[PDB]
Design a protein around this motif. Structure first.
Motif, mmCIF file in Angstrom:
data_model
loop_
_atom_site.group_PDB
_atom_site.id
_atom_site.type_symbol
_atom_site.label_atom_id
_atom_site.label_comp_id
_atom_site.label_asym_id
_atom_site.label_seq_id
_atom_site.Cartn_x
_atom_site.Cartn_y
_atom_site.Cartn_z
ATOM 1 N N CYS A 131 -3.374 -0.338 3.238
ATOM 2 C CA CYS A 131 -2.177 -0.657 2.469
ATOM 3 C C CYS A 131 -1.286 0.572 2.316
ATOM 4 C CB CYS A 131 -2.561 -1.197 1.090
ATOM 5 S SG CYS A 131 -1.311 -2.294 0.347
ATOM 6 N N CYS A 156 0.563 -3.696 4.442
ATOM 7 C CA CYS A 156 -0.646 -4.055 3.709
ATOM 8 C C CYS A 156 -1.333 -5.258 4.349
ATOM 9 C CB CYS A 156 -0.311 -4.362 2.249
ATOM 10 S SG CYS A 156 -1.703 -4.123 1.099
ATOM 11 N N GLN A 157 -0.537 -6.136 4.951
ATOM 12 C CA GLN A 157 -1.068 -7.329 5.600
ATOM 13 C C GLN A 157 -1.265 -7.094 7.094
ATOM 14 O OE1 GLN A 157 1.735 -10.172 2.929
ATOM 15 N NE2 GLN A 157 2.060 -8.011 3.448
ATOM 16 N N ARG A 158 -1.771 -8.108 7.786
ATOM 17 C CA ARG A 158 -2.009 -8.010 9.222
ATOM 18 C C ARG A 158 -1.029 -8.889 9.995
ATOM 19 N NH1 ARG A 158 -7.155 -10.465 6.804
ATOM 20 N NH2 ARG A 158 -8.411 -9.636 8.537
ATOM 21 N N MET A 159 0.180 -9.030 9.462
ATOM 22 C CA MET A 159 1.206 -9.842 10.103
ATOM 23 C C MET A 159 1.497 -9.339 11.513
ATOM 24 S SD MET A 159 3.258 -11.991 7.719
ATOM 25 C CE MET A 159 3.916 -11.801 6.064
#
Length: 14
Positions: free
Chosen positions: A4, A11-14
């Motif tokens: 993050c 922070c995400q795995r987009m």
């Protein structure tokens, strides 16, 4: 990845 990073704001795995 769950890191993050407060820099890039990834922070995400987009």
């Amino acid at each position: 990845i769950i890191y993050c990073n407060r820099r890039t704001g990834k922070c995400q795995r987009m």
